Amino acid sequence: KPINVRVTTMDAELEFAIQPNTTGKQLFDQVVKTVGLREVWFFGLQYVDSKGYSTWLKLNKKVTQQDVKKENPLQFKFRAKFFPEDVSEELIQEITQRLFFLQVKEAILNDEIYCPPETAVLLASYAVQAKYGDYNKEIHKPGYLANDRLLPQRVLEQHKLTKEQWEERIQNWHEEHRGMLREDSMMEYLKIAQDLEMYGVNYFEIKNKKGTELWLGVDALGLNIYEHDDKLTPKIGFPWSEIRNISFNDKKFVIKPIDKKAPDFVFYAPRLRINKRILALCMGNHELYMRRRKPDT
């Protein structure tokens, strides 16, 4: 018999059934269509497996041989897996823009992406403009932002100001966005976010030969090694151009610099589930990177 399935996006829930022989690629294409998004390369379908780990559905396989968590409606989350190099050039459909806007903003708030106080209020202003529209003394009564998650905790737990002092600071900016179309605001937000050091990078905790704890970062432009204490500034950088190739064997992964004379860089991932996760993301970003430069060739 059929299989129930629930798939959510940053703002749209989709429930429907599907035959036991359907593939992820089919499921993905299903959602893609029901929502109307064309720029698909950035997205993927995420699901918790039986043992609780968050996993990306392999499109090249039966959504039933993936060991997703067994529940009445199988649960999936449609999210952006990769990030453009520039949301201006790359994000065209107002739907893709809104989807990316919600994901990133959610990441800012959950302190998943570090963000300074000033920049965070500015980001918040664009968020209210996109939500509430233009400021209106008559409609937007003093405290209209009473129940809105605007700044990431760190910011608030940096007790310089009080709750109401932040709201004002935000309202101050809100007023300076008159006539800003709801779509423009979200794009403004992203133009700012996309420039945060932590923006769009995936971190994996790893170690070198000397058992020193480090941070591996993977993003649009390549890989970065971070000191375990600071995930904002890299300790070593490895742009795509800078690399010869990257070999994965077990929990170990090696970056071979193209500098010929240069030495190999060996790192170890804590678990296998992790090393595989990296390779996937490395390939993915590298692929989109190349597809931006050397067209459908």
C-alpha positions as YAML, in Angstrom:
chain: A
units: angstrom
residues:
- id: 1
  name: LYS
  ca: [0.00, 0.00, 0.00]
- id: 2
  name: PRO
  ca: [0.94, 3.74, -0.35]
- id: 3
  name: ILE
  ca: [3.07, 5.83, 2.01]
- id: 4
  name: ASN
  ca: [2.10, 9.07, 3.73]
- id: 5
  name: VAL
  ca: [4.60, 11.91, 3.47]
- id: 6
  name: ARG
  ca: [4.81, 15.39, 5.01]
- id: 7
  name: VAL
  ca: [7.23, 17.92, 3.53]
- id: 8
  name: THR
  ca: [7.73, 21.45, 4.83]
- id: 9
  name: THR
  ca: [9.49, 24.53, 3.48]
- id: 10
  name: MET
  ca: [10.37, 27.59, 5.53]
- id: 11
  name: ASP
  ca: [6.71, 28.54, 5.25]
- id: 12
  name: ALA
  ca: [4.66, 25.91, 3.38]
- id: 13
  name: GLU
  ca: [3.51, 22.48, 4.57]
- id: 14
  name: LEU
  ca: [2.81, 19.81, 1.94]
- id: 15
  name: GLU
  ca: [1.19, 16.47, 2.70]
- id: 16
  name: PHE
  ca: [0.57, 13.68, 0.18]
- id: 17
  name: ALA
  ca: [1.12, 10.00, -0.56]
- id: 18
  name: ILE
  ca: [3.45, 8.03, -2.80]
- id: 19
  name: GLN
  ca: [4.11, 4.46, -4.03]
- id: 20
  name: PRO
  ca: [6.77, 2.26, -2.32]
- id: 21
  name: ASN
  ca: [8.84, 2.27, -5.50]
- id: 22
  name: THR
  ca: [9.22, 6.05, -5.87]
- id: 23
  name: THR
  ca: [12.65, 7.59, -5.68]
- id: 24
  name: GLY
  ca: [13.86, 10.65, -3.83]
- id: 25
  name: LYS
  ca: [14.46, 12.38, -7.13]
- id: 26
  name: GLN
  ca: [10.81, 11.77, -7.88]
- id: 27
  name: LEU
  ca: [9.73, 13.07, -4.48]
- id: 28
  name: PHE
  ca: [11.96, 16.10, -4.83]
- id: 29
  name: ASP
  ca: [10.47, 16.84, -8.27]
- id: 30
  name: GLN
  ca: [7.03, 16.40, -6.73]
- id: 31
  name: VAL
  ca: [7.61, 19.12, -4.13]
- id: 32
  name: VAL
  ca: [9.45, 21.32, -6.63]
- id: 33
  name: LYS
  ca: [6.30, 21.38, -8.76]
- id: 34
  name: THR
  ca: [3.65, 21.74, -6.04]
- id: 35
  name: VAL
  ca: [5.46, 24.85, -4.86]
- id: 36
  name: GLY
  ca: [6.61, 26.28, -8.20]
- id: 37
  name: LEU
  ca: [10.36, 26.65, -7.77]
- id: 38
  name: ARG
  ca: [12.75, 26.40, -10.74]
- id: 39
  name: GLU
  ca: [16.17, 27.13, -9.28]
- id: 40
  name: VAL
  ca: [16.41, 23.69, -7.71]
- id: 41
  name: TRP
  ca: [20.21, 23.19, -7.53]
- id: 42
  name: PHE
  ca: [20.34, 24.95, -4.17]
- id: 43
  name: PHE
  ca: [17.85, 22.66, -2.46]
- id: 44
  name: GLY
  ca: [17.62, 19.19, -0.98]
- id: 45
  name: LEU
  ca: [15.24, 17.10, 1.16]
- id: 46
  name: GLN
  ca: [16.24, 16.52, 4.74]
- id: 47
  name: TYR
  ca: [15.06, 13.82, 7.15]
- id: 48
  name: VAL
  ca: [15.88, 12.31, 10.53]
- id: 49
  name: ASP
  ca: [16.92, 8.66, 10.22]
- id: 50
  name: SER
  ca: [16.02, 5.92, 12.69]
- id: 51
  name: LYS
  ca: [18.84, 6.81, 15.09]
- id: 52
  name: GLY
  ca: [17.94, 10.51, 15.23]
- id: 53
  name: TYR
  ca: [20.57, 11.93, 12.89]
- id: 54
  name: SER
  ca: [19.58, 14.55, 10.37]
- id: 55
  name: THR
  ca: [20.15, 13.22, 6.87]
- id: 56
  name: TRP
  ca: [19.87, 14.36, 3.25]
- id: 57
  name: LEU
  ca: [17.64, 12.14, 1.10]
- id: 58
  name: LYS
  ca: [19.56, 10.48, -1.74]
- id: 59
  name: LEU
  ca: [17.53, 11.38, -4.85]
- id: 60
  name: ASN
  ca: [19.02, 8.43, -6.69]
- id: 61
  name: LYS
  ca: [17.17, 5.86, -4.58]
- id: 62
  name: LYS
  ca: [13.82, 4.69, -3.22]
- id: 63
  name: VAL
  ca: [12.71, 7.09, -0.50]
- id: 64
  name: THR
  ca: [12.07, 3.81, 1.29]
- id: 65
  name: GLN
  ca: [15.58, 2.30, 1.32]
- id: 66
  name: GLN
  ca: [16.96, 5.38, 3.06]
- id: 67
  name: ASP
  ca: [16.05, 4.35, 6.58]
- id: 68
  name: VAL
  ca: [14.14, 7.51, 7.38]
- id: 69
  name: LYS
  ca: [12.39, 7.70, 10.78]
- id: 70
  name: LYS
  ca: [9.25, 5.57, 10.72]
- id: 71
  name: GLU
  ca: [6.17, 7.63, 11.57]
- id: 72
  name: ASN
  ca: [2.63, 7.94, 10.22]
- id: 73
  name: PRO
  ca: [3.48, 10.62, 7.72]
- id: 74
  name: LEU
  ca: [7.15, 10.25, 6.87]
- id: 75
  name: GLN
  ca: [8.74, 13.57, 7.80]
- id: 76
  name: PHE
  ca: [10.86, 15.72, 5.47]
- id: 77
  name: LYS
  ca: [12.11, 19.30, 5.43]
- id: 78
  name: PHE
  ca: [12.81, 21.04, 2.12]
- id: 79
  name: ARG
  ca: [15.79, 23.31, 2.65]
- id: 80
  name: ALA
  ca: [18.59, 25.15, 0.88]
- id: 81
  name: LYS
  ca: [21.60, 22.87, 0.88]
- id: 82
  name: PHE
  ca: [23.91, 25.14, -1.06]
- id: 83
  name: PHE
  ca: [24.23, 28.92, -1.22]
- id: 84
  name: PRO
  ca: [24.72, 31.11, -4.28]
- id: 85
  name: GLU
  ca: [27.84, 33.20, -4.49]
- id: 86
  name: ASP
  ca: [25.60, 36.24, -4.90]
- id: 87
  name: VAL
  ca: [21.90, 36.31, -4.05]
- id: 88
  name: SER
  ca: [21.48, 39.20, -6.51]
- id: 89
  name: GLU
  ca: [22.67, 37.44, -9.64]
- id: 90
  name: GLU
  ca: [21.72, 33.92, -8.59]
- id: 91
  name: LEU
  ca: [18.31, 34.16, -6.90]
- id: 92
  name: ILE
  ca: [15.66, 35.04, -9.44]
- id: 93
  name: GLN
  ca: [12.25, 33.64, -8.46]
- id: 94
  name: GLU
  ca: [10.54, 35.58, -5.69]
- id: 95
  name: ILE
  ca: [9.80, 32.15, -4.22]
- id: 96
  name: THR
  ca: [13.45, 31.11, -4.06]
- id: 97
  name: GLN
  ca: [14.25, 34.49, -2.53]
- id: 98
  name: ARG
  ca: [11.58, 34.15, 0.15]
- id: 99
  name: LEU
  ca: [12.70, 30.62, 0.88]
- id: 100
  name: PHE
  ca: [16.34, 31.56, 1.26]
- id: 101
  name: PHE
  ca: [15.41, 34.66, 3.27]
- id: 102
  name: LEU
  ca: [13.53, 32.59, 5.84]
- id: 103
  name: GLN
  ca: [16.25, 29.95, 6.22]
- id: 104
  name: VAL
  ca: [19.13, 32.45, 6.69]
- id: 105
  name: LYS
  ca: [17.08, 34.68, 9.02]
- id: 106
  name: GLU
  ca: [16.23, 31.66, 11.14]
- id: 107
  name: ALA
  ca: [19.95, 30.89, 11.30]
- id: 108
  name: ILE
  ca: [20.78, 34.43, 12.37]
- id: 109
  name: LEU
  ca: [18.30, 34.30, 15.23]
- id: 110
  name: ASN
  ca: [19.44, 30.87, 16.44]
- id: 111
  name: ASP
  ca: [22.98, 32.24, 16.63]
- id: 112
  name: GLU
  ca: [24.02, 29.63, 14.09]
- id: 113
  name: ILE
  ca: [25.57, 32.50, 12.18]
- id: 114
  name: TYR
  ca: [27.44, 35.09, 14.22]
- id: 115
  name: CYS
  ca: [26.22, 38.65, 13.63]
- id: 116
  name: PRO
  ca: [27.24, 42.04, 15.21]
- id: 117
  name: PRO
  ca: [24.67, 44.18, 17.13]
- id: 118
  name: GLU
  ca: [24.30, 47.03, 14.68]
- id: 119
  name: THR
  ca: [24.10, 44.76, 11.69]
- id: 120
  name: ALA
  ca: [21.55, 42.63, 13.59]
- id: 121
  name: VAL
  ca: [19.21, 45.58, 14.17]
- id: 122
  name: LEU
  ca: [19.52, 46.64, 10.53]
- id: 123
  name: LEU
  ca: [18.73, 43.09, 9.53]
- id: 124
  name: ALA
  ca: [15.78, 43.17, 11.90]
- id: 125
  name: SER
  ca: [14.47, 46.41, 10.41]
- id: 126
  name: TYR
  ca: [14.31, 44.89, 6.95]
- id: 127
  name: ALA
  ca: [12.53, 41.91, 8.48]
- id: 128
  name: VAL
  ca: [9.76, 44.05, 10.00]
- id: 129
  name: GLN
  ca: [9.44, 46.09, 6.80]
- id: 130
  name: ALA
  ca: [8.94, 42.84, 4.92]
- id: 131
  name: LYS
  ca: [6.45, 41.72, 7.52]
- id: 132
  name: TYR
  ca: [4.51, 44.78, 8.72]
- id: 133
  name: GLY
  ca: [5.02, 46.86, 5.57]
- id: 134
  name: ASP
  ca: [5.60, 50.61, 5.98]
- id: 135
  name: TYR
  ca: [5.60, 52.25, 9.43]
- id: 136
  name: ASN
  ca: [2.32, 53.88, 10.36]
- id: 137
  name: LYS
  ca: [1.86, 55.81, 13.62]
- id: 138
  name: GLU
  ca: [-1.85, 55.09, 13.27]
- id: 139
  name: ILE
  ca: [-1.57, 51.32, 12.75]
- id: 140
  name: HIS
  ca: [1.78, 50.33, 14.21]
- id: 141
  name: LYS
  ca: [1.14, 51.23, 17.86]
- id: 142
  name: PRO
  ca: [4.14, 51.76, 20.25]
- id: 143
  name: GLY
  ca: [5.27, 48.22, 20.93]
- id: 144
  name: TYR
  ca: [3.98, 46.53, 17.80]
- id: 145
  name: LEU
  ca: [7.21, 44.49, 17.81]
- id: 146
  name: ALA
  ca: [6.42, 43.14, 21.24]
- id: 147
  name: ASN
  ca: [6.14, 39.51, 20.19]
- id: 148
  name: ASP
  ca: [8.66, 39.16, 17.38]
- id: 149
  name: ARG
  ca: [11.99, 37.33, 17.45]
- id: 150
  name: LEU
  ca: [14.28, 40.01, 16.07]
- id: 151
  name: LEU
  ca: [17.82, 39.72, 17.43]
- id: 152
  name: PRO
  ca: [19.97, 36.65, 18.04]
- id: 153
  name: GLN
  ca: [20.29, 35.76, 21.74]
- id: 154
  name: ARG
  ca: [23.99, 36.70, 22.02]
- id: 155
  name: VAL
  ca: [22.96, 40.25, 21.13]
- id: 156
  name: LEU
  ca: [20.29, 40.41, 23.84]
- id: 157
  name: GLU
  ca: [22.47, 38.50, 26.27]
- id: 158
  name: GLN
  ca: [24.95, 41.32, 25.76]
- id: 159
  name: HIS
  ca: [22.72, 43.26, 28.16]
- id: 160
  name: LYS
  ca: [23.77, 46.70, 26.95]
- id: 161
  name: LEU
  ca: [20.15, 47.66, 26.28]
- id: 162
  name: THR
  ca: [16.80, 46.42, 27.51]
- id: 163
  name: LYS
  ca: [14.06, 44.81, 25.44]
- id: 164
  name: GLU
  ca: [12.28, 48.09, 24.72]
- id: 165
  name: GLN
  ca: [15.50, 49.89, 23.88]
- id: 166
  name: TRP
  ca: [16.13, 47.38, 21.08]
- id: 167
  name: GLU
  ca: [12.57, 47.67, 19.78]
- id: 168
  name: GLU
  ca: [13.04, 51.41, 19.48]
- id: 169
  name: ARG
  ca: [16.40, 50.96, 17.78]
- id: 170
  name: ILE
  ca: [14.63, 48.69, 15.32]
- id: 171
  name: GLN
  ca: [11.67, 51.01, 14.83]
- id: 172
  name: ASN
  ca: [14.14, 53.79, 14.10]
- id: 173
  name: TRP
  ca: [15.32, 51.87, 11.04]
- id: 174
  name: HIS
  ca: [11.88, 50.58, 10.14]
- id: 175
  name: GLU
  ca: [10.78, 54.17, 9.54]
- id: 176
  name: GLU
  ca: [13.70, 54.72, 7.16]
- id: 177
  name: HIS
  ca: [12.39, 52.06, 4.77]
- id: 178
  name: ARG
  ca: [9.24, 53.77, 3.52]
- id: 179
  name: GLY
  ca: [8.03, 52.45, 0.20]
- id: 180
  name: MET
  ca: [10.23, 49.39, 0.39]
- id: 181
  name: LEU
  ca: [8.43, 46.59, -1.43]
- id: 182
  name: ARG
  ca: [8.07, 43.42, 0.64]
- id: 183
  name: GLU
  ca: [10.24, 41.51, -1.88]
- id: 184
  name: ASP
  ca: [12.97, 44.15, -1.87]
- id: 185
  name: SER
  ca: [13.25, 44.00, 1.89]
- id: 186
  name: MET
  ca: [13.95, 40.28, 1.90]
- id: 187
  name: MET
  ca: [16.58, 40.83, -0.78]
- id: 188
  name: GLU
  ca: [18.10, 43.66, 1.25]
- id: 189
  name: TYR
  ca: [18.27, 41.36, 4.26]
- id: 190
  name: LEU
  ca: [20.14, 38.72, 2.25]
- id: 191
  name: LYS
  ca: [22.52, 41.22, 0.64]
- id: 192
  name: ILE
  ca: [23.60, 41.96, 4.21]
- id: 193
  name: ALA
  ca: [23.53, 38.43, 5.62]
- id: 194
  name: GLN
  ca: [25.44, 36.91, 2.70]
- id: 195
  name: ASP
  ca: [28.39, 39.00, 3.80]
- id: 196
  name: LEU
  ca: [28.64, 37.61, 7.30]
- id: 197
  name: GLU
  ca: [31.85, 35.61, 7.73]
- id: 198
  name: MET
  ca: [29.91, 32.56, 8.94]
- id: 199
  name: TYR
  ca: [27.28, 32.87, 6.22]
- id: 200
  name: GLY
  ca: [26.68, 29.80, 4.11]
- id: 201
  name: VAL
  ca: [29.51, 27.69, 5.48]
- id: 202
  name: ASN
  ca: [29.16, 24.18, 6.87]
- id: 203
  name: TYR
  ca: [31.33, 23.33, 9.87]
- id: 204
  name: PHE
  ca: [32.56, 19.88, 10.71]
- id: 205
  name: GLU
  ca: [34.59, 19.22, 13.80]
- id: 206
  name: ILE
  ca: [37.82, 17.41, 12.82]
- id: 207
  name: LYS
  ca: [41.42, 16.78, 13.88]
- id: 208
  name: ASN
  ca: [44.85, 16.69, 12.29]
- id: 209
  name: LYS
  ca: [47.61, 14.13, 12.77]
- id: 210
  name: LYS
  ca: [48.58, 15.80, 16.06]
- id: 211
  name: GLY
  ca: [45.10, 15.23, 17.47]
- id: 212
  name: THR
  ca: [44.59, 18.99, 17.54]
- id: 213
  name: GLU
  ca: [40.90, 19.94, 17.46]
- id: 214
  name: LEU
  ca: [40.01, 21.99, 14.39]
- id: 215
  name: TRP
  ca: [37.08, 23.23, 12.31]
- id: 216
  name: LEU
  ca: [36.58, 22.33, 8.64]
- id: 217
  name: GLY
  ca: [34.49, 24.74, 6.65]
- id: 218
  name: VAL
  ca: [32.95, 24.10, 3.26]
- id: 219
  name: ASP
  ca: [31.31, 26.81, 1.20]
- id: 220
  name: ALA
  ca: [30.68, 28.09, -2.31]
- id: 221
  name: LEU
  ca: [34.31, 29.04, -2.83]
- id: 222
  name: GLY
  ca: [36.03, 26.01, -1.26]
- id: 223
  name: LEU
  ca: [37.36, 24.80, 2.09]
- id: 224
  name: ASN
  ca: [38.85, 26.44, 5.22]
- id: 225
  name: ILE
  ca: [40.63, 25.23, 8.34]
- id: 226
  name: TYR
  ca: [39.64, 27.07, 11.51]
- id: 227
  name: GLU
  ca: [41.22, 27.24, 14.94]
- id: 228
  name: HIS
  ca: [38.85, 25.51, 17.32]
- id: 229
  name: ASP
  ca: [38.21, 28.74, 19.25]
- id: 230
  name: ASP
  ca: [37.29, 31.03, 16.33]
- id: 231
  name: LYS
  ca: [34.89, 30.01, 13.55]
- id: 232
  name: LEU
  ca: [34.91, 33.49, 12.01]
- id: 233
  name: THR
  ca: [38.43, 33.73, 10.62]
- id: 234
  name: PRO
  ca: [40.16, 30.83, 8.82]
- id: 235
  name: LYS
  ca: [43.63, 29.60, 9.84]
- id: 236
  name: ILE
  ca: [44.22, 28.14, 6.38]
- id: 237
  name: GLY
  ca: [42.27, 28.66, 3.17]
- id: 238
  name: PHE
  ca: [41.81, 26.34, 0.23]
- id: 239
  name: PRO
  ca: [39.93, 27.99, -2.63]
- id: 240
  name: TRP
  ca: [38.96, 25.61, -5.43]
- id: 241
  name: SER
  ca: [41.71, 27.09, -7.64]
- id: 242
  name: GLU
  ca: [44.14, 26.45, -4.82]
- id: 243
  name: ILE
  ca: [43.39, 22.68, -4.78]
- id: 244
  name: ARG
  ca: [44.68, 19.75, -6.84]
- id: 245
  name: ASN
  ca: [42.20, 17.21, -5.49]
- id: 246
  name: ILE
  ca: [40.67, 15.92, -2.24]
- id: 247
  name: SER
  ca: [40.89, 12.24, -1.28]
- id: 248
  name: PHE
  ca: [38.53, 10.51, 1.13]
- id: 249
  name: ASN
  ca: [39.45, 7.21, 2.72]
- id: 250
  name: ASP
  ca: [37.65, 6.02, 5.86]
- id: 251
  name: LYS
  ca: [37.42, 8.84, 8.41]
- id: 252
  name: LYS
  ca: [40.48, 10.49, 6.88]
- id: 253
  name: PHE
  ca: [40.49, 13.11, 4.14]
- id: 254
  name: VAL
  ca: [43.47, 14.67, 2.39]
- id: 255
  name: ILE
  ca: [43.76, 17.94, 0.51]
- id: 256
  name: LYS
  ca: [46.49, 17.82, -2.14]
- id: 257
  name: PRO
  ca: [47.52, 21.41, -3.03]
- id: 258
  name: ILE
  ca: [48.04, 22.20, -6.71]
- id: 259
  name: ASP
  ca: [51.23, 24.04, -5.72]
- id: 260
  name: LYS
  ca: [53.07, 20.83, -6.61]
- id: 261
  name: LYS
  ca: [56.05, 21.54, -4.37]
- id: 262
  name: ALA
  ca: [53.52, 22.07, -1.55]
- id: 263
  name: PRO
  ca: [52.76, 19.30, 1.03]
- id: 264
  name: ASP
  ca: [49.54, 17.34, 1.52]
- id: 265
  name: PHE
  ca: [47.13, 18.36, 4.26]
- id: 266
  name: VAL
  ca: [45.71, 15.49, 6.27]
- id: 267
  name: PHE
  ca: [42.69, 15.74, 8.53]
- id: 268
  name: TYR
  ca: [40.47, 13.24, 10.32]
- id: 269
  name: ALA
  ca: [36.72, 13.32, 10.81]
- id: 270
  name: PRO
  ca: [35.38, 12.07, 14.18]
- id: 271
  name: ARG
  ca: [32.91, 9.64, 12.63]
- id: 272
  name: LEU
  ca: [32.34, 8.09, 9.23]
- id: 273
  name: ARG
  ca: [28.85, 9.58, 8.92]
- id: 274
  name: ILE
  ca: [30.73, 12.88, 9.03]
- id: 275
  name: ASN
  ca: [33.45, 12.30, 6.47]
- id: 276
  name: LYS
  ca: [30.78, 11.19, 4.02]
- id: 277
  name: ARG
  ca: [28.81, 14.31, 4.77]
- id: 278
  name: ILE
  ca: [31.83, 16.47, 3.83]
- id: 279
  name: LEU
  ca: [32.62, 14.73, 0.55]
- id: 280
  name: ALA
  ca: [29.00, 15.19, -0.46]
- id: 281
  name: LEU
  ca: [29.06, 18.92, 0.31]
- id: 282
  name: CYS
  ca: [32.53, 19.39, -1.21]
- id: 283
  name: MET
  ca: [31.42, 17.78, -4.47]
- id: 284
  name: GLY
  ca: [28.20, 19.73, -4.41]
- id: 285
  name: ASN
  ca: [29.78, 23.15, -3.97]
- id: 286
  name: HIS
  ca: [32.58, 22.42, -6.34]
- id: 287
  name: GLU
  ca: [30.04, 21.32, -8.93]
- id: 288
  name: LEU
  ca: [27.91, 24.46, -8.72]
- id: 289
  name: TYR
  ca: [31.14, 26.50, -8.70]
- id: 290
  name: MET
  ca: [32.28, 24.98, -11.95]
- id: 291
  name: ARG
  ca: [28.81, 25.22, -13.45]
- id: 292
  name: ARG
  ca: [28.92, 28.98, -12.89]
- id: 293
  name: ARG
  ca: [32.19, 29.39, -14.77]
- id: 294
  name: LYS
  ca: [32.29, 26.70, -17.46]
- id: 295
  name: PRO
  ca: [28.60, 26.56, -18.58]
- id: 296
  name: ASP
  ca: [26.69, 23.35, -19.37]
- id: 297
  name: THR
  ca: [30.04, 22.09, -20.70]
...
